[model samples]
Target chain A: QVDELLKLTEDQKKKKKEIMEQESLWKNPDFKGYNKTFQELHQLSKTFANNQFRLALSNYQSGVNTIMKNRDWVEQYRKEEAEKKRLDEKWYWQKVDRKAREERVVYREKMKAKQDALNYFSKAINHLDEIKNPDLRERPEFKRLLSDVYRSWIMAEYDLQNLPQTIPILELYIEIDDNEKEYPAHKYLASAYSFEENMIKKTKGPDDMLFKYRYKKNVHLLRATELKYGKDSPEYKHIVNVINR
Target chain B: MEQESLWKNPDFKGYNKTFQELHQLSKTFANNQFRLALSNYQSGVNTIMKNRDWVEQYRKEEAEKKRLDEKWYWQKVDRKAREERVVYREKMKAKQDALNYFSKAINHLDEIKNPDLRERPEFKRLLSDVYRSWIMAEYDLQNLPQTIPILELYIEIDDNEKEYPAHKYLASAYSFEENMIKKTKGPDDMLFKYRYKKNVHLLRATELKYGKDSPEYKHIVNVIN
Candidate 1:
């Protein structure tokens, strides 16, 4: 009985495969004839063979959908098989690509660190209430703490793709870190501005007046790039081109 | 004379009265006439004829000497006390300045943004300085919120973490934060990850401050477990 059940399963599977093949045959150009054999023959024979091929082709075309419902179980079976194969391959590749998985694992760990960092900053910022206003704004450690926290927050938001959160923090970070060579702030802000500009352009068309709002901030971004990576550096030149463009 | 014996008693009162009168007059004469005669006597001599005693001059010189000696002694004492007071004040100020140095350096941190500046020997020296002052502040000032980040920055900036007190203060700050989280968010709440961070820093501090083999480290490890 077991053997019989297994046999039925195998038979059903084979039937499904056969039906899928037929459907593929009907859907694709497999029935297109070769003209070489007819071309090599004499014109009379060629004409005769062509007529014969045409009738056969016409008959197959007529029976293609009639033999099996092209839009039925076979189609569903094809989809199921395709999905199964995708699952199988995805699982297989994940196991096989050890380095890729490790890299992703490392990346995820880094993102988790960023998350933890942001958590630390949250606690630190809340704890800022303990420090008086003068120290909060004036003290080197407080300012440095703010800069560090802001930098961490911006990086986290950037990595986490929280654009709205990232934009303001980056602005604060740049403001707190008022210097010529604070590259990360400038670089991330530039990218963020470009991204926001692109998003605006996408939603409201490129020619919208609001597009220039984010676009104009590229001057500082370019300046930061130039300071960090000299005027000759590709990063600097690239940013310049991107701005001008 | 024999006849007079009988009257000797009667004459005695008379003689006694006479003697009393004479004595009174002589006393008056001595008192008034001696005073008058002494007043009338004036000499234009440089030296009056009188007994000069060595001890009297010695006594006067000794009193002056004693007064000068006391004045000099008290001046010395006063100067010494004043000097000590100055030293004491300076020492107290020095203690305050240790914490102030940390604060001042922290305030000056806003000006120093460049990583290159931090890498310089001056920066290292400054780190060394602030490291000491920060530890002083941690111990003396005892402001946890301020101490935490200050120590954090010290740990970040300082090259020699093992030699420094930053990790110790960091451990303390973490514990404080952990306790704060527990206090505010409930003991069992999944509030924050400060406990783990606390242990990490505690372990680091234990290893750095007291060797990893010590009982302090063992205790920390046990606590972590």
Candidate 2:
């Protein structure tokens, strides 16, 4: 049915073109040499128009055949487009999955590394807490080692849980380093104070105490670092200004 | 009534020979007067028709002049609008060009990477000074360069401010440095000390006169370089 309709359309188009040519010739001033062509074109136009009218009538009468042909073409094109879209979606999802897997691997590695560092520092602090004798506390070497252990423990706790409990140990570490003019103790103290102040401002309602301790810890830690490491150092200066502001 | 009867008497001397000639003439005097009046009426009608034709001709000329004047007025307005559009487009294009020049210059600076070269205190100071000078120069040279002496003085001062004490020593050190290292070092050193300063200054001068962010900057940069 489609084939027959296509053939008829082609014939109609040719006939229409012939009719227009005939009309052109009739209007032309130089029509002396084209009389035969003009007459044939005019006759062909009338025949084509009549054929088109008959075809239209036939299609209207036999509605089933015409409807089936159009439905088949539309269905075929829709299936083809749907298949192409499915393939495109499948390809896109595969890429997304691969990227997700890679990101997961990176995240897992980062988490593991952070956990290991925290465990090592926690062990060092536990060792220092075990040496609680007055004789050890009185020795300068023991005092220096204890201070280092406290600093590492504080940093580790801050990194792992980021809880408020880690702050006071950081403060103690700063107090121990306060007399040292050779380092960034003052700078560290400044930073710790600033951090605590900021935390106080941010923490609301019942959680204020938790944030306050955390802020205090960070402030003392920053002060100690500022006193120990000179304020001229970027880290010391950054912390000092951070806590002061 | 007695005078009228005396004039009517056939022997009255008041009745002269002219009256006897009038009685013997072919045409009457009253008829001659009627013909003269008709001729005058026809001439008057002809004169009126001629005047009406002249007035119509003048009116037509005035209408034509009015039409021409309206056409000319609209044409002048359209021409003025077209000129303004051209000027606006030119200004926009110039601004775009200046921005492009600055972006390219910044990208060129980014390619250089040498820690020691970038850390040179005098080089950093000189480059910053030149950049400031270039900004000042742009404001001074706006629209046109009316004072060549001032412009030249600005350039001279900027040049004098650049200190290249370590350049000769660095050239000797390049022999021991690897090719890649040398290449990286050269650009960073040159950029921090001299190239960026010179390029920025040149770009500013070009942008100021021609309008910022314009294609004219590229052309000027090319010419100066």
Candidate 3:
């Protein structure tokens, strides 16, 4: 039975990999067949800005709905696996007189670690209440520290898996910290913008406007961070070095 | 050109409103984009589960290959290979043991989970243990034969300002050594002037001058002067 289950698991793994590969292929900007449909839609939007906005809005809504459905599926799978493990443990203890519970425990721990990683990503997406406006201070040092704390919080959120949540928060963070002296905030903002540009360009079929927006945002934020923090500052230097490289 | 005259312009109000609206709009767009990205990630993860079988098979095949390779190596050069393997195994085992101990300590500390315990002796001991384990892990990864006592001494000192000089010196040393090894220019001297660097350098110099085990270790531990 265990061998059969393992075989089934392998089949599932292959199917999953194929599905992911398909999804990634769709994400390519140069995807052949989708080009005509996108071109028509792009032309239609150019004819009417309001219509373009509506199209974007509709896509956004459908995207959100699809994501919610995916989240539900993940949660359901997690719950089902948790129950299965519970039952498996019970069976092991009662029927299968096995002393090697240690191996099972290690496997369970690994599963829990994976679950925790998932949960971390989920929490990062769901939670936004921790973000706060730093108190405006007269002193440069105080304002600088306040900016550091804010940037650190932003970094913590970005460190969470999932680029979607990470990118937007970083964008909003930069817009808020606009003109602030801290170098890291701008550098982070630029990286986030770059990621967004890549994401939109790849997934949504090479929108030049999106790319330009990202490029401008990156440059502006970088300049702002540098002006406030000296070029010699680690944060400024880091961003400049990255851009130059 | 005075700031007061600039504010007196009637167009300033309109400009301010536009800026405010733009900021709010940007925030809204950011929030929406974040949600979309998260959804895509979730979809990606679900797709991973669908390929569980392939993953399991891959893991098994990889593990089998490793086992076979080890077996062949051992068979070909029994005495020399066995001795080296034993040493390598012992080192890995020790590392695993240390990691396990550190994890246990963290679990124990988490069970307490009291902010006040930070000031307690037990918490301090646990902190020390964790720090020691971390340094050992670094040493193991670097394949260093012996622990750097200066590094250990630097960790023990608990003063803020006093630690700056030693920290700075260490940074300078690291930056210099790193560049020297790479045959490239090191970081600016100003970079090492940060409060953290100054204290680190002081501690390292003290440790080098008077051995870590010496009586002067206590006097030089956290002294800013």
Worst 10 residues of 1 chain B by lDDT: B42-51
> What are the per-model DockQ values?
0.00, 0.00, 0.01
- Better model by lDDT, 1 or 2? 1
Residue-level lDDT of model 1, residues A56-165, one tens digit each, is 33332233222123224434643564355332231112333543454355445545555555565555555544455563345444454455445545644554455557
Model-by-model lDDT, in order?
Answer: 0.47, 0.39, 0.41
> Candidate 2, residues B1-225: lDDT per residue as tens digits?
332232121222332442343333313322332233223322332332343354447446643553322212223334445644553344344334433443343343333356554344432332332232223223222311222222343234323323221121122223223243445766556444443434455555455445566798778567656
lDDT of 3 by residue, B17-64 (tens): 533643454354443332332233223223322333343464466435
TM-score of 2: 0.23
lDDT of 3 by residue, A66-135 (tens): 3334435544754664455432332112222332343344334433443444344334333222223233
| lDDT winner | 1
Docking class of 1: incorrect
Task: Name the TM-score of candidate 3.
Answer: 0.21
| A155-241: candidate 2 lDDT, tens digit per residue | 334333343455466556645533333233333333445445556657653566656655655645554454434357676676557
DockQ of 3: 0.01
Q: What is the fnat value (0 to 1) for candidate 2?
A: 0.00
